[PDB]
Amino acid sequence: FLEVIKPFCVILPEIQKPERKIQFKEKVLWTAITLFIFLVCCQIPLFGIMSSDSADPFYWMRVILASNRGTLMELGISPIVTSGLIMQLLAGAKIIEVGDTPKDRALFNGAQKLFGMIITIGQSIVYVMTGMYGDPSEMGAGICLLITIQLFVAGLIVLLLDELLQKGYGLGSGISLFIATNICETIVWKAFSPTTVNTGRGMEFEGAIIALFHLLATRTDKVRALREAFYRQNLPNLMNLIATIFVFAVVIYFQGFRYELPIRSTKVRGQIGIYPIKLFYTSNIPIILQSALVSNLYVISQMLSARFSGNLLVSLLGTWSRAYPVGGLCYYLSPPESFGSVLEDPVHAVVYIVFMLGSCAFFSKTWIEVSGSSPRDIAKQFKDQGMVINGKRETSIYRELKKIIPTAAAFGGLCIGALSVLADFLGAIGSGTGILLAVTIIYQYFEIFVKEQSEV
């Protein structure tokens, strides 16, 4: 197993471990270069595609996957996430060992890259053969192989860029950076796009601010121009951007919440300090997990309805009508798009709110149990550091953590779900999922910045 795959592990390229720690300014520069490369690849279409007119059942796995259909980033960050969860499950099921020796973790990284590349090849083959990019029989072996090679090398670039970020050149991981970059790109596009669409009422810009300026300059600077620019229905609004800024501000405010535990040291005396237990204890993992669950359920419902239509169970799981849920569990798990949608079906809005809050709370608690951030898992860190709580005994470190951390995780789940629901209700551009992910990732970057400043 490990012995026979180690020579297969070493073939893949690896990022050189930096000789000296990289400062924050040029860390930001390298992160900007990495996201620029990812964005440029997101715009270049694959070669050999005859038709991009298909179903694309994973349309909702695009904000959390940083995927753009038909381009070099067809798969987005799916190889990285798949390899990460595969390795975490393998380590937790004791087939392999991450270890602590540099050789052990180097082999772990090499095998993670190997499994990510295997997943990349598998996804590319599935995408090619299952009818996307055109008929695989019509494209031929040469075109199908060329598309598979393009997707393979694009995935190799994604893993290389993520490894570049993680080895110390960037500000985090490829997953968070690419997700936040896609969300911010979407919001800025819907704010400032020069794209124009004509529906019989002349030229009309697709970006909100550009449409505002165009209308104010053209239509006699009328109050009707401002009313349309703020309450436009066929294109992005100015009220949608105002609600996006408002949700940004509120999520920032609630991301700044923390429970500051006064901790001292019983090993190195004089190391008074603070342990911040954030209200958003699991930063955006509830969003990622909830979006993945809902989107996977959507894919399952679409697959069942397409093949096994008419069955009562399939209809209850979801009714579809491009597609969007119209009935069933998939509908009740779908955000109400407009205020009129909320008004016509209050029951759907209530069920969506309850499901979002409960799922976010459940995923937050499950993640603090899984990822090693449980109260017991933090009490182990307190014990094997000499750290105790200032006004509490050393034998009571776990009980205070048991009081704080589970409640912090659950209520962070509720707060995050409520923020996403509020953003979805207000019509915020970027959506609740996108806005929350973007704010949490930029806050991770900001907290890395303040950590580096404190180290100075």
Binding site: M61, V81, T82
Partner: peptide, 10 residues
Amino acid sequence: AXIXXXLTXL
């Protein structure tokens, strides 16, 4: 593939 909170299209 759609199994689950996993994210591995198709």
